[PDB]
Symmetry: C3
Subunit: 152 residues, 3 copies
């Protein structure tokens, strides 16, 4: 037995040391271009791309375009948008069924923070969503270039 | 002694984490970070006024660069030369003129003032700036200097 | 007792958090190929300054030793739309490109007619956006990509 027990005290100690260095490196990681809320991390690319290119960039990297599902997440996304001062695309579109915004998974929105008047399908052709510096959403034509923020 | 089987599998995965985390540190710190002892300095890459620079670092969990030793100052200095822009440090004397404190309130443990500094030029220099040669100069808090935080 | 299986839980939690961390770290500026990570600085510098930057950071300038590595490096160079410097030079022996360890090349992906040492001036190697290599003067400014 008790060799076993020494090994546990040893392993536990090297594990606690690794979670200490991991917390510090997580903060350094997110500065300046990232934000975490719960288990989700938003990180911006720092550049501007049309919806399809933005979505491709995020899935290829193993994530998804920012999809705020609660008020706290929208706040965290807003910090990133305020810091960069460019509005960002969110993941959701209504291109399947005009007027029903769906997460890229197909499910209906659980949270929304639409600017008054929106969504308004302006010009007959506004299928993507953009979050502005004030945290409110506006629907926008997918072909516009907006800030790429992915979530992981 | 079933446990021994699971403990050896664990040792192997801890060992895997330890080595992957070691590679990641270097990747992470490239090109905007520098570590000295237990501390990491990371530059935001952009220039901002003191009160803003300070907010950005506190919102991110950190603190503005506060070198407490020559080894710490030389590591901050390497980031400043690479970026080629002077950077604010955390210390000010906006509460008591002449007494520079860390944001916590204690007096300076190390200083590397340029000859003649701090000189409170114009009656209005309450923040400290580190130059590309590693010497500190007291500067007006409303200038825009490189944001470097410490973690 | 199962103070082991408490530890088990903490290891698996780190493995999940560390896996999420890697994705965030590599977005948008890095690529992993096997054990190797390529990461760009984002800016452009001449060979010696690029070579210093990488070694200072604990790593090396990109040395793609396989078609697979050169492809990950190329995915980075297309995203920045800027050709990158590779580690290899022939500055010791004109026409034998060496990796900085001193050995001869394993893998090459030269463009047709390269290396041609245009002007007598060309001792460093750039990778273009199409993945093809060209020998270029070391004093040109190119994207800094290091490998870890
Ligand atoms: Ca439509
Ligand atoms: Ca619509
Ligand atoms: Ca609209
Ligand atoms: Ca004063
Ligand atoms: Ca003063
Ligand atoms: Ca002064
Ligand atoms: Ca030559
Ligand atoms: Ca040559
Ligand atoms: Ca050539």
């Amino acid at each position: 037995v008790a060799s076993l027990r020494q090994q546990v005290e040893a392993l536990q100690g090297q594990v606690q040391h690794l979670q200490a260095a991991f917390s510090q490196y997580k903060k350094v990681e997110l500065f300046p271009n990232g934000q975490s809320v719960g288990e989700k991390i938003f990180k911006t690319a720092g550049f501007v791309k049309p919806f399809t290119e933005a979505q491709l960039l995020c899935t290829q990297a193993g994530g998804q375009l920012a999809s705020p599902r609660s008020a706290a997440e929208n706040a965290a996304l807003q910090q990133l948008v305020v810091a960069k001062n460019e509005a960002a695309f969110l993941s959701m579109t209504d291109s399947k069924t005009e007027g029903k915004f769906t997460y890229p998974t197909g499910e209906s929105l659980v949270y929304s923070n639409w600017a008054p008047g929106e969504p308004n399908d302006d010009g007959g052709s506004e299928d993507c969503v953009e979050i502005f510096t004030n945290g409110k959403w506006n629907d926008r034509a997918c072909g516009e270039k907006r800030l790429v923020v992915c979530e992981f």
